[PDB]
Every structure is written in C-alpha cells, then in structure tokens.
Design a protein around this ligand. Structure first.
Ligand SMILES: NC[C@@H]1O[C@H](O[C@H]2[C@@H](O)[C@H](O[C@@H]3[C@@H](O)[C@H](N)C[C@H](N)[C@H]3O[C@H]3O[C@H](CO)[C@@H](O)[C@H](O)[C@H]3N)O[C@@H]2CO)[C@H](N)[C@@H](O)[C@@H]1O
Ligand SMILES: Nc1nc2c(ncn2[C@@H]2O[C@H](COP(=O)(O)OP(=O)(O)CP(=O)(O)O)[C@@H](O)[C@H]2O)c(=O)[nH]1
Ligand SMILES: [Mg+2]
Ligand SMILES: [Zn+2]
Lengths: 83, 99, 208, 405
RNA sequence: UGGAGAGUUUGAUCCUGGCUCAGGGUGAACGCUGGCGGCGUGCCUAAGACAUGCAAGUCGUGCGGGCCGCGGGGUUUUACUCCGUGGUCAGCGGCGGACGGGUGAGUAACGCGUGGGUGACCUACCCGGAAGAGGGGGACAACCCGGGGAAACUCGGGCUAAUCCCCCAUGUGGACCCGCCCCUUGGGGUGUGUCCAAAGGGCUUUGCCCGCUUCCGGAUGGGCCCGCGUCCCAUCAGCUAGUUGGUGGGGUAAUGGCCCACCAAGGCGACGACGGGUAGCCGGUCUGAGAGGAUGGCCGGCCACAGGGGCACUGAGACACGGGCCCCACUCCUACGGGAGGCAGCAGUUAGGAAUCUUCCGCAAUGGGCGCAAGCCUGACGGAGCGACGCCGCUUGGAGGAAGAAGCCCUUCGGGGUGUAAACUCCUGAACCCGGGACGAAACCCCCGACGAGGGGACUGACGGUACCGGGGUAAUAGCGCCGGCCAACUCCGUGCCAGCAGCCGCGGUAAUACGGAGGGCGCGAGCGUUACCCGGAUUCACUGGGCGUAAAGGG
RNA sequence: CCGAGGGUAGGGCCCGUGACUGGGGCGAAGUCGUAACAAGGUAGCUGUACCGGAAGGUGCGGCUGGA
RNA sequence: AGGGGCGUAGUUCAAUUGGUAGAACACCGGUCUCCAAAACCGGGUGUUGGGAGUUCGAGUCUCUCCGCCCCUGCCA
C-alpha cells in the first residue's frame, strides 16, 4: 500500500533522507507520490527536519502507513498532537 | 539445490484440480439447462438453471471464477433460457427467472 | 603543484618586474634590476613583433604567475568569473584576490606569496577562529584572518609583523599588528590593485 | 568440499629419479598404497592416475613430474616423481630443483645405465643433498651374488660425484609385487606380507639418514615456480617449492623474472595437494592463486618473492667453477663470445660469456671471474647458486659475485 | 547579456570551392611518466559459454504431529503413555515468491512521449462507513505396516487436525432475467422472481487485541482506447482474406476481427501504403550566439527480455529471472529405465576485444517480505577493495644567497647562457611516532499516563580505532609535449631527396630554426601526449542564413 | 481443432567466395607518337555514325566558348 | 611444458661427393651536375640465425640455444 518513508539522497557518508509518501513497491530512492519533508540524521543547521503537517495528516487519514523510523520523525514535528 | 517454493507448486495442482471441477460442472449443468429450454420443458428447465445459477455464484466466493465473470455467465444463461421458453413455452415454473 | 622553480626568470621573460620573493625583490638585485631581458641563450636579441596571440598569452601568464596558481585553478576560476554578474574583468581579480594564501600575503603575515602558502599550508593561519590550511580557500567579506597561537612565538611571524609598524594595508583590509589578526573588510576593486596587468586582454585570450 | 590441511608432522620433499623402465613410477604408486593402511591422510594413487596425461598413459612412459602426498606417523612427505629418458630432463631437472632428498632407483637386471649417471650428475649440480638407492627388478633369476655386484658398482657411482655412496641406504626388492598384493589388499599393515615389508625398509630408511634441512621463515620470502595452471572460476595458480619465509592468503607478492617489468599482486589462496593451506612456510610445496593475473603473465622460471626484495637483472659479473672433462664436463675452451644455458632455480635462460682481461682461454677445471649478460631479465640476488649446461652436459657451477645494473 | 578567426589553388589579384588548423565534449583505449586524499565512475565486444558459494522467505498467536530435555506420575509401578511449557525437522495451512536486483537481445510499435477518454473496466495488502460472524458434515499430507528404486524419489493399504474443502441457514446488502421512472454508449433510483456470506486464535476472559465474511466510499497500483509527435532507402510502388465492415456467437476484469461461423465488398497508398535497413523510447547528455546539430553510458520513468522456441496452471496480479509442462542445442550422472543444469541476481572464470574490477565487510542505517511481538530472511542496500578513467583539493618546500662555482652549451675569443638556479645559512614540518576519539542512533521495546496526545528510561556502529583532534618530528617525486608558418618558443653538431618528419602548406639533394642528438626556450604538470568518435568554427543543406549568364546548378 | 518443432518441395532477399575477364585510381626521371593550349601549324568543341597502335580521323547537323 | 617446420648479402635465389659462398637486380664509390636521372668507370657490401662439437677444413654432419609458424599437452 501507500507508505510514508525515507528516500535517501545526499552523498556517501552524508545521508540526507527525504520524507515521502509512496507506493510500498516503488524502489527506495525511486519515484514517489508526494514529498512532505527531509531529515538530516546528522543535524547540521537549526533546520534538520521540516514536515508539512496538513499534508502528512491528509495521507495518514487515507491509508498511508509510516515506517517506525518515519513515525518518530513525523511525530517529532507533531503530526498526532490534538490537545 | 532445491527451494521450499515447490510447496507453492504442489499447493497449486490441488487448487487447479479444485476449481477445474467446479468449472466443468457449470459448463455441463448450463448446457443441459438450455437444451431443455429450447425443447420447451419449461419446468425441469428452470429447475436446472436455478441450480446452476447456484454453482456459478459459488465459484465467485472462491478463486475459480469471480465477480463480473460469474455474473456474465448468468446473464447469458437466463438471457438465454428465456429466449427459448418463448417457443410456445409460457414459463410455467417461474422458479428462477422472474416475469 | 605550485610551480616551484626559478622565479625571477619568469620576472624576466614577462619583462615587467614581478614580485615573487618580496624581500630580495626590493633589493638591488631582482635580477630584473640587473639583466632586464628574457632568460636563455638568446634573450637579448632583436625582439620580433608579437602576434596578438603572444600579446594575450603573455598578459595572462603575467597575471597568473603573479599569484603562483596553476592553469587548472586559474582558468577554472576565470570561467566562474564569467558566469557571475558584473564586469568579469574585475570580478576575476576580486576572486584571485579573495584567495586565502594571498590575503595572508596581503596582510604581511608572509613576505612573499610562495611563503604565504607554506604558512597557510602548515596550519599557521586562522580564519574566524578556526584554522584553515587551504591556500585556495575563498575569504568572504567581514571575515577575520589571523595567526594561530602555536605560531606567534615563531621567528618569522614576528619580523613580517614587525614590519607592519607604521605601514598601511590595502584600502580593503584591516590590520591589528599587535595581535596578528586582520579582517577582510571589502572585496578589492580593480583600482585598489596596482597590477602591471591588462585584465582586459586576459579575457580575450580565453575567448578564442 | 576440499578440506583444510592439518599440519601435524614436518614436511619434506623427496623426489624419485633413475633411468627408464626401472620402476620409478610404480615404486611411487607403491609408497602410496604401502604407507596408506598404516595411516589415513594419504589418498591412494595408482600406476594409472599417477601418470594421467594421455600418451603418458596410452603411450606407456612418464612425461611430467608427478607430485604425490604420503606420510608416516613420523614424517610427512611430498613425492615429486621425475621422468626417465633424456629429452624430458628439463622436467626432471625442474622436479629435482626441489626435492630435499632423492630416492634413486636402479634395476638389478640392467644395472646403472646412461641416464642413471646423468640423473645422479644432475643431483650433484641441482643441489639434492642426500640420495637413497632402491634396487628394483630383484625378483629376477636367482642371483646368489649378482644383485650384490649392483650395490658394489652403484655405490661406486655415488661416491664418484661427492655422494656418501658407501653410506647410502640401498634397500632391495620389487615394487610391482609389493604393489600388486597391496593393489588387492587395501587395508593391511607391515610385518606381514613379504615384499610390502621391503618397501618399508625404504620408507623408514628415509625418515632416518635423509635430513629435514636448516629451514627459516624469518628472511623475506621467495618461491621458484615449477608450473602454472588455470583453475576454472578461480584463476591462475602457480606452483613451486618455497624458499625462504612464508605466505598466507591476502599477502602482496611480486612475480620476478622473464618479462618486461615485474607485476605485484595479492595472493588469493594457497594449498598443498588440494588442501586449503592456512599459511605455507619455507620448504613447503605450494600452489598459489594469484589475484587477477593471467596465464600469459606467470611463467615457470620466475619467482614470487616479497615486494622490494630481489629485482630482475640481466648482466651479472659472477665467479664460477668449470667442470673438467673427467667430471663429464667440458673438453675444450670457449671465447668471450660463448653463449651457454644457466639454470637459476627452476629456469634456464641463455646468457653470454664476456670473459675478463687477460683470460684468452678457459679449459677443464679452472674457475675465473667472468661476466655475463642474460637474454631474459631474471630474478638475481647476491650469491645465488647456479650451474652451466650446454650441448647435453653440465660444464660449470658458480655464484653471483657481483651485480651489474 | 549574445555571435572573433587562421593556412592552403596564382607571377600577382578578386571571386568560387574543398581540404585543414585554433574551442569544447567522452563509460575511453594506447605511449612515456606517476606521490597523497575526497567524491564520482569502470565489458562500448560474445543477450558467448560458465566450476564454487550466496542472492526469498517467513509466521506455533492457523493445525496435527516426529525428536531431545524438564514439570505430576495416569495406577500404587512400566500398561489404553493424558496435560503444563520453551528449543528442533520436515508436513499441512496463510501471506510474500509478479516487488527488490539484472539486461537491452527483440521492438519503427499506441513500445515510447505528450494531452485526453473508460456510460467499457480490474486493484492483494492499507485507510473510512454499514452488516454479520448460526449450525452442521468430509478429505489429504505428516506418522505406522507393506511393495519398487542406484539415485532424483514414486505407487498400494490404514487413520488424523485445522484459519483446507464441502453443504444448509440469516441476507445490512450484492449478483442475474423482465418491467417502470430519470439519465443518456453498459449510470442512478425501483419492483416480483432466483442465486451468494464467513474461521478461529491469543490473552490480563459477557472484555479487549488479531484475523474472518459481504457491501459502499477512499487511497495507491494498473488494463484498454484516442489526437498529435518519434531514423534511413522510392534503384521498395503498389499492399491486403480475417483482409475492411455487418449480424449473431465464444472469450475477458473490460471495448475490440481479439477468436468463430454467416452476409456483404471493403480497407490502405506519393500527406509514402507494402518492403528492406537500423534502433530499446523519454527525463536528460554534449555542442551551438541562436535556430540547429549529435546523442540516449551514470541516476529516474516506461517497454521488452530471463539458454533457444511455445504453453498453460496457481494467483488481486505472471502466461512468472533463481515456478511448472513440451521441443531444441549443449554440458553433466547412471547401478543404463531414468536423473541434473542455465549467473542479462552478487562476487568470480574463460572466450572475444584496443579495453572495463573483490570469489570483501555488515544488516549499524534506509527500504522490502512474513510476524502480536521478540525477531528471522534481505549480494536491495550501507560500506570497504582494485584502475590517475574522471572532476576537485594537496605535496615534492619557504626566506636569504655571487656582476654570478663547477659540469654542459653558444662564442664576432673580448664574452654569453643555464641563474638564485646550486652550494650555503637559517625557517617550517608530507611522512613517520605516541595519545584521545566520533556524527551517522532513536525507535521498535519498557515505565507514569487509556497500547491516545504528551513525558522519562534502556539496547544497537559494518565503515573504524577510520574520520577529526592534541603532543613530538625528518626537506621529504617530476614528468610529458612542443620550438618552419598557422601557433607560445632558437642555436650548435650529425645526416646529405639518405635516414627520416608531416594536422594542412611542406621539410631533407654537404652552412637543414622543419630529420637525429645536444644546449637553450615555450606550454602544461601528476600528469602530458597519441588514436577514435560528436558539435563548433562551416551562411560548407543556408528556417534564422546560400545559390544556378561565364564558378556546381534552368528541365530541349 | 489449434499448435512449438521436425520433414518433403519450390521460390525470394542477403553476406562471403570463384577459373577467367573488363575497365579505374595511384606510383621522380621506361616506349610510341603529338590530339589540345598561339589558323597550336587541318579553328575548337559537341550529339551521332563508321574507321584507326594511341592520342584521334572522317561523315551529317549544331555551337562560338574562333578570325 | 612435448612433438614437427623455417631461418644464406638489400631482395628473390644456387652451390649439400664436406672444400671463402656465387647469379640477377639493387647498393656504395668516382667522373659530369645545384643535386639526381642517363652515361662511363670501380667495390660483394654476408652475423650462411646465435654458441660451441667433430674436423686438416663445415652452408652442409652433431648438439645446445633465439625467434616464428603447426599439431598435442596442461585445474592449487
Ligand atoms: N593517373 C593517370 C591516369 O592514367 C593515364 O596515365 C598513366 C600512364 O599512361 C602514365 O605513364 C607515364 C608515361 O606516359 C611517360 N611517358 C613516362 C612515365 N615514366 C610514366 O609514368 C608512370 O609510370 C612510372 C613507372 O614506369 C611511375 O613511377 C609513374 O608514377 C607513373 N605515372 O602514367 C599514368 C599512371 O600514373 C592517363 N593518360 C591519365 O590521363 C590518367 O589520369
Ligand atoms: N619384473 C619387474 N618389472 C617391474 C617392476 N616394477 C615395474 N616393472 C615393470 O615396468 C613397467 C612400468 O615401469 P615404470 O615404473 O613406469 O617405469 P619408469 O621408472 O617410470 C620409466 P620412465 O619414467 O622413464 O617412463 C611395469 O608395468 C612393469 O611391467 C618390478 O619390480 N619387477
Ligand atoms: Mg616414470
Ligand atoms: Zn624578482
């Protein structure tokens, strides 16, 4: 099904994942459905994880299934927070 | 040398053997039905038809035939059995085919 | 890598007294100040008329040798000057100037650019606190270039610094002779640099 | 499904020489069957597969030095089986240039023959310290005191080229019979069957007398190549007998001698009679799978030393002794334009004889300081040992006294 | 924000015109030379043949057993060997093996690209809504006995469990025939008749968690169809029988000649049909002032293929790379009746070629499959290795240092050059030595709290003892091409239309800046040259932007 | 029935090759003559036809790019 | 690795009873010329594949070795 995961980018020894909704069957760094964020596991800049909530939520509310390490990130940007 | 993917093979022959029969049945049972519908045997006609519409629709529950396939056979068994019971038929036993 | 070899010989060939040693090159012997002709078995014989190509080749070699850069870097740098907005004739020099090991030279930390390099190469210099050993490093405006602590007590860091007493650095650099610092205030303008080179021609050599 | 070599006892290479049709091979296959029963780790070979090369087989004779592995609860051996005849001498000489000890083989019925001589002569010039005789073909006509005359004249031959002939252990018996019963007697120890016990007199006779030479694995490394094979899916394998030091999988090594410039590689594997050796040591008889090199680059005669130790050199001024005609050497003299065939380790590259100033001639005996330039750059060191053949008879022997380039 | 020309036909000139040079680009190869690091990148040929190992499994929270070791001894002991509960080997059953990885052989095609159509359709797993989950019956492996077989393994008889199959019931609903309404190619509401549902499993047990069944909505992924675009040859000009259309059937998820009977005679073509040749197509790549021209290797997308040729089965999906069946070639086994294999998956061999790599390390991260989960599988992948193949950064030193060693080379014998170059004096500190030492890894999971939001806590590093950092510390690689003009750079000697050079024009016939060497010089520098290929200059196929009286060119 | 493949027969296109044979391009200083360039010593050239060791000659018509 | 062939001036080739090696064309030298071509004079110019062997004396007969072609081998 449609998932929310990390698609790698950047250089060797310089991981730079892009947060993306995409059919599970697509290869990793292949073509996706929509881009919703990026995550630098090495945090270099007070900007190491942006995530569009509105959209992240749309997808979730339709079937999109996050990865464990993709939920943590989503969450960290406060996707689930309702109050 | 070999892989536990033969399980999938063996497994298959059976299922093959399975719906193969569920399929033969529907062919034969639906022939006999129209053969008797063209002849005029209105009663023993629907008697059989209505009994095939059964075997057919069951194929759909499984992995033999399915959905629109199953439905297709029907709309050509009733749409058929009816265009035969006109040869001076008057569907006495309105068993399955509604008037 | 960096040429390495007879230098006042280049000083000669080009004709224009080039400054590739700093010290002695002000002495009564830059060689140019002693035998102002091209090196080699000929050098002092009727100079034929130079093809527009010679004129351009020579004017480029002049500029380039004045920095101790390789063709690969020099050109590659020029090509970038082309793309950036503004008269590339200028920008180019601005980039050649913004080079690190050069600014170390443009600040007195070293008498000659060859020396400036080795200095930069061996840690001896520091940009904005952290130490750089990349001669090629491009100093950006407002940045601070300075001698690293482990170096201040060195025979050399001293003297070259001892000379900056009463002297003034190029109108685009600031200097704290007392604490071996110095800022790269502004990107030098074609004017500010009194170079014996017609950058206009260097641009022509690289077109056709 | 290859198995790891379990180095228990010490390894010594013994070869088998002697004239033609005198049992060299069978006696070899014998040691296989004999030493078999009384211990595993041997793998039986027969008169057939010892000589698996078509013709060699179909035609009758032995054409390529074999290479067999058999042990004793005392000492592990590697048996290099040379061919008789002449012609192939270039293959016995290469087999001999290895073997620590030579199991000479003479025949009761024939006695010491022309090749029996030369072989012994080559052994005295190859460097095979220690020989053992084995009179075969004894099971012939009751010779009350005839087979005795053999051991009287064979010893004369050995003590005729600087060999402990009078001491040399001359066992007696037949290999065929010995073999024959064993052939149809797989399992069965000694101290039982007649002739089989005649083989052991030889085997043991080897565990004794014959040494197990001063060996070292502290100096660099070196390995003269005897042959090269292409092992399917694996690559180019080069065999030989190690000289100094050791070698394990993953090590750098250079192929030195007989080419333009030497190629360095990385060993990809080592073995010993198809046994995955973990680390072959000096004196070991190995096989080396050389990383990504082709059978067109490795060649019998070059070395496999450690990178930086011993380069290839063409010209070499080296002191040398010349065998006199009585020694079966030269019966004349050569000019400063003489071109003989030297033999460095397992290879023979022809060189020139640019003789020094004032030596307008050189005849039998003698030994001066003459220079020489080889036509093929060969791996040379300081004091390397070499001989000098030509025409079909050794003519000298000396060592590098100095190196030109 | 963008446009440079030069050499060469003549005694000389202008024009025409071809050749050639100066720029840039490459999966390169070859020669000489070669120190370090990082990021890239590396069979262009035989879609040749390939030893070996490994690349797809996973669930006991679906089911029954085989085996090994513990709880209580069924009985009082071993007996009709029953449970409690984690390891093990298949079986049965589920979901995945259709994706991930490989390749470009084939393909001129709706294959691809682009924009649309589907009232002509399908979609496992995943979300959201509604309704259920009631009863019954049976088989087949596993295992035991017998028989055949060298082996790969197959046949007879006998039980056995399930979320396996089968049958009835309920029918929120759904399917099918005929009729009406609305709409308008098969869509939406509706009526009578007929037909179709399902499985338990684990617990912390009238309740949760996980499955199950049918139906609607949604996502994602797809099938089909249509407009337009997509190379050369016209010395390929006519082509076509399922051929074009119809009616009615079969087939499919679905339209359709897709397949078949029947009827008719059509359909197509100079706007290039038919045929032949070549070729995977695009995003993009290179070049160009641009318009153009060339190109399709890394990576991304689509197609096609999996020894060669065909086929169907299972399945949401394949007519299926590590599934099946047949044929072919080929290689291999045999106990001679039958068995075995397919690296265009990874690593690797060999053959071919001018030429293209490790039988590496690790699931730590990211992604995937199965699973309640722990976690197992993952040659995807993350890494390391080899090659100056490429781009980028770095070193071989820095400052002094003579009207100026020597050696070598010119010399109007007075002198000149190599040249501050060297030596030499200090100065620094590649290497090497010793020491600390990573980021990439927070969550699956546990805990306060509703397994909610939110908070706190714990494990996990292949690369690596590497990067990066600090202390001490040695001057410690240089080559290659070129110097007649174009084109930066000249002298001597040797040679004597010889030897030889040569991109074009040309050099060499006894004073050769052109050959060979030497000195000197120019260019570039861990590289420099050579060959090959594309664009440019070339307005030299001219749309931008050409021409045809005599230069090629007006048709009799 | 269809149907991969195999067989028998007859065609079509292509790559390679063949005794012999035709002309062509190219190669400092070999042989014959002398067609053209100046009425080039017979104005030249041209289509066609015949003839000749070779250039070429002749016929008929045409051209001027001859006087 | 084991068999079998082949190596004569510059180029094609002849002398093998064992006897310095010629024949043609090249080629070099000289005269004439700026230099060749022609002409005229004059010179075999060779590593008989290399090195040894036997021999009074080897192109030949032995042998060893180098390069090339041909066939057969060759899994640690
Ligand atoms: N390429 C020439 C073509 O053939 C012919 O010409 C060919 C021959 O007739 C002509 O021969 C000439 C000869 O005429 C003249 N009187 C003497 C001259 N030595 C020869 O020369 C010819 O032969 C010698 C060898 O002998 C070669 O070295 C030379 O290169 C070659 N042209 O040489 C030509 C071959 O190159 C046509 N006449 C000509 O128009 C045509 O284009
Ligand atoms: N009488 C007898 N004949 C024997 C003996 N040993 C061997 N042979 C014979 O010799 C034959 C082959 O001998 P082999 O061992 O190959 O000889 P070789 O020593 O290898 C000779 P080369 O190696 O040179 O070919 C045997 O088949 C047999 O007839 C023995 O002890 N006595
Ligand atoms: Mg033998
Ligand atoms: Zn100077």
């Amino acid at each position: 099904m449609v998932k929310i995961r990390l698609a790698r980018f950047g250089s060797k020894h310089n991981p730079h994942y892009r947060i993306v909704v995409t059919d599970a069957r697509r290869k990793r760094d292949g073509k996706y459905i929509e881009k919703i964020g990026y995550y630098d596991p090495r945090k270099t800049t007070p900007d190491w994880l942006k995530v569009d909530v509105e959209r992240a939520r749309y997808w979730l509310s339709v079937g999109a299934q996050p990865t464990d390490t993709a939920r943590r990130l989503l969450r960290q940007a406060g996707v689930f927070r309702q109050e | 040398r070999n892989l536990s993917a033969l399980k999938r093979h063996r497994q298959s022959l059976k299922r093959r053997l399975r719906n193969k029969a569920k399929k033969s049945a529907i062919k034969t049972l639906s022939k006999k039905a129209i053969q008797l519908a063209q002849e005029g045997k209105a009663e023993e006609a629907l008697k059989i038809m209505r009994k095939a519409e059964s075997l057919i629709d069951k194929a759909a529950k499984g992995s033999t035939l399915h959905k629109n396939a199953a439905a297709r056979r029907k709309s050509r068994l009733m749409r058929k059995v009816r265009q035969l019971l006109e040869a001076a038929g008057a569907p006495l036993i309105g068993g399955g085919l509604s008037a | 890598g960096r040429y390495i070899g007879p230098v006042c010989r280049l000083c000669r060939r080009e004709g224009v007294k080039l400054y590739l040693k700093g010290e002695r090159c002000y002495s009564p012997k830059c060689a140019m100040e002693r035998r102002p002709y091209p090196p080699g078995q000929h050098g002092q014989k009727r100079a034929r008329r130079p093809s527009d190509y010679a004129v351009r080749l020579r004017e480029k070699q002049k500029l380039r040798r004045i920095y101790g850069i390789s063709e690969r870097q020099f050109r590659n740098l020029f090509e970038e000057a082309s793309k950036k907005k503004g008269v590339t004739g200028s920008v180019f020099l601005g980039l050649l100037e913004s080079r690190l090991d050069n600014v170390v030279y443009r600040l007195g930390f070293a008498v000659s650019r060859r020396q400036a390099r080795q200095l930069v190469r061996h840690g001896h210099i520091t940009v904005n606190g952290r130490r750089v050993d990349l001669p090629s490093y491009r100093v950006r405006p407002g940045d601070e270039i300075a001698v690293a602590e482990k170096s201040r007590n060195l025979e050399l860091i001293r003297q070259n610094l001892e000379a900056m007493k009463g002297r003034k650095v190029g109108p685009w650099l600031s200097l704290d002779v007392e604490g071996m610092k110095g800022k790269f205030l502004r990107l030098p303008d074609r004017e500010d640099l009194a170079l014996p080179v017609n950058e206009q021609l260097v641009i022509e050599f690289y077109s056709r | 499904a290859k198995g790891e070599f379990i180095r228990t006892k010490p390894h010594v290479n013994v070869g088998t020489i002697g004239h033609v049709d005198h049992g060299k091979t069978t006696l070899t296959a014998a040691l296989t069957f004999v030493t078999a029963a009384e211990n595993p780790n041997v793998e039986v070979k027969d008169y057939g597969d010892i000589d698996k090369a078509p013709e060699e087989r179909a035609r009758g004779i032995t054409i390529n030095t074999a290479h067999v592995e058999y042990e004793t609860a005392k000492r592990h051996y590697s048996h290099v089986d040379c061919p008789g005849h002449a012609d192939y001498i270039k293959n016995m000489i290469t087999g001999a240039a290895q073997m620590d000890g030579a199991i000479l083989v003479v025949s009761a019925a024939d006695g010491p023959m022309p090749q029996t001589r030369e072989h012994i002569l080559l052994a005295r010039q190859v460097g095979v310290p220690y020989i053992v005789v084995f009179m075969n073909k004894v099971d012939m006509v009751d010779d009350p005191e005839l087979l005795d005359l053999v051991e009287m004249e064979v010893r004369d031959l050995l003590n005729q080229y600087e060999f402990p002939g009078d001491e040399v252990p001359v066992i007696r018996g037949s290999a065929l019979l010995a073999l024959e019963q064993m052939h149809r007697n797989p399992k069965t120890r000694r101290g039982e069957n007649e002739w089989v016990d005649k083989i052991w007199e030889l085997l043991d006779a080897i565990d004794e007398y014959i040494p197990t030479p001063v060996r070292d694995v502290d100096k660099p490394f070196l390995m003269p190549v005897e042959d090269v094979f292409t092992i399917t899916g694996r690559g180019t394998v080069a065999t030989g007998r190690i000289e100094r030091g050791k070698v394990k999988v993953g090590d750098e090594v250079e192929i030195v001698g007989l080419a333009p410039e030497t190629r360095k590689t990385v060993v990809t594997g080592v073995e010993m009679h198809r046994k995955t050796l973990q680390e072959g040591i000096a004196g070991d008889n190995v096989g080396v799978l050389l990383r990504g090199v082709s059978r067109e680059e490795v060649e019998r005669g070059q070395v496999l030393a450690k990178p930086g130790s011993i380069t290839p050199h063409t010209k070499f001024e080296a002191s040398v002794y010349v065998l006199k005609k009585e020694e079966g050497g030269r019966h004349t003299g050569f000019f400063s334009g003489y071109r003989p065939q030297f033999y460095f380790r397992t290879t023979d590259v022809t060189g020139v004889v640019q003789l020094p100033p004032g030596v307008e001639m050189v005849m039998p005996g003698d030994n001066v300081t003459f220079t020489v330039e080889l036509i093929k750059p060969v791996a040379l060191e300081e004091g390397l040992r070499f001989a000098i053949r030509e025409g079909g008879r050794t003519v000298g022997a000396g060592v590098v006294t100095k190196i030109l380039e």
